[PDB]
Curated annotation (Swiss-Prot):
Pfam families with a match to the protein in the record: Cutinase (PF01083)
GO biological process: one example: carbohydrate catabolic process
GO molecular function: cutinase activity
Keyword set, alphabetical order: Disulfide bond, Glycoprotein, Hydrolase, Secreted, Serine esterase, Signal, Virulence
UniProt-recorded name of the protein: Cutinase 1
Biotechnological applications: May have promising applications in chemical and textile industries as it is capable of hydrolyzing a variety of substrates including soluble esters and insoluble triglycerides. Can hydrolyze and thus modulate the surface properties of synthetic fibers such as the plastic poly(ethylene terephthalate) (PET), or the textile fibers polyamide 6,6, polyester and acrylic.
Record keyword Magnesium present: no
Coiled-coil region list: none
Gene name as annotated: CUT1
Family in the record: Belongs to the cutinase family.
Protein purpose: Catalyzes the hydrolysis of complex carboxylic polyesters found in the cell wall of plants. Degrades cutin, a macromolecule that forms the structure of the plant cuticle. Allows pathogenic fungi to penetrate through the cuticular barrier into the host plant during the initial stage of fungal infection.
PTM comment, free text: The 2 disulfide bonds play a critical role in holding the catalytic residues in juxta-position; reduction of the disulfide bridges results in the complete inactivation of the enzyme.
Summary of temperature dependence: Optimum temperature is below 30 degrees Celsius. Optimum temperature is 30-40 degrees Celsius.
Compartments where located: Secreted
Length: 197
């Protein structure tokens, strides 16, 4: 439901083929918030329960609203937490294909983490989905150092955070359809394009 720690809890001797690491939006609960569970259920349907590990970014990521204003759109402590989960995935399951996602502050966190990542781990993230990406205008719809074809950004018309502001208006809360359909569709297509483990 809103908390999933499959990578932290998972046995190294029985690694999943696909590991999904997801960062929630500001003030959301658990470590998956409102959109993460929808994506996770569809990934489990596609790869099976034992085929995919879903891992939310918890720990030091507090998803505090005011941290949207910081230079990278989140705190340094939160970036260190998500970087540590990508490193744990890489160590515990070296042959797994990774996929990532984030909503609002969590999309800025996913972009900042992926930019800072060691290139050999970054290159294993087959696809990343970003909803209500707060650095969309500033980064021109991209994640620094990461290919455009592996990125999909969902930014609604009238969601002001996509156009350089930090005002929260009603379109910002309307990503439920995307999380149920096109975002898991893109992630599954990018994993099958390369394959799994």
């Amino acid at each position: 439901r809103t908390t999933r720690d499959d990578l932290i809890n998972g046995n190294s001797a029985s690694c999943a083929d696909v590991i999904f690491i997801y960062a929630r939006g500001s003030t959301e609960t658990g470590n998956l918030g409102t959109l993460g569970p929808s994506i996770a259920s569809n990934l489990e349907s596609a790869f099976g329960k034992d085929g995919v590990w879903i891992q939310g970014v918890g720990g030091a990521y507090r998803a505090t609203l005011g941290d949207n204003a910081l230079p990278r759109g989140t705190s340094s402590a939160a970036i260190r937490e998500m970087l540590g989960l990508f490193q744990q995935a890489n160590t515990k399951c070296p042959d797994a294909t990774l996929i990532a996602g984030g909503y609002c502050q969590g999309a800025a966190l996913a972009a900042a983490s992926i930019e800072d990542l060691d290139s050999a781990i970054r290159d294993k993230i087959a696809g990343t989905v970003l909803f209500g990406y707060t650095k969309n205008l500033q980064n021109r719809g991209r994640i620094p150092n990461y290919p455009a074809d592996r990125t999909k950004v969902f930014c609604n018309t009238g969601d002001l955070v996509c156009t350089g502001s930090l005002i929260v208006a009603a379109p910002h809360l309307a990503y439920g359809p995307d999380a149920r359909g096109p975002a898991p569709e893109f992630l599954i297509e990018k994993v099958r394009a390369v394959r799994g483990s």
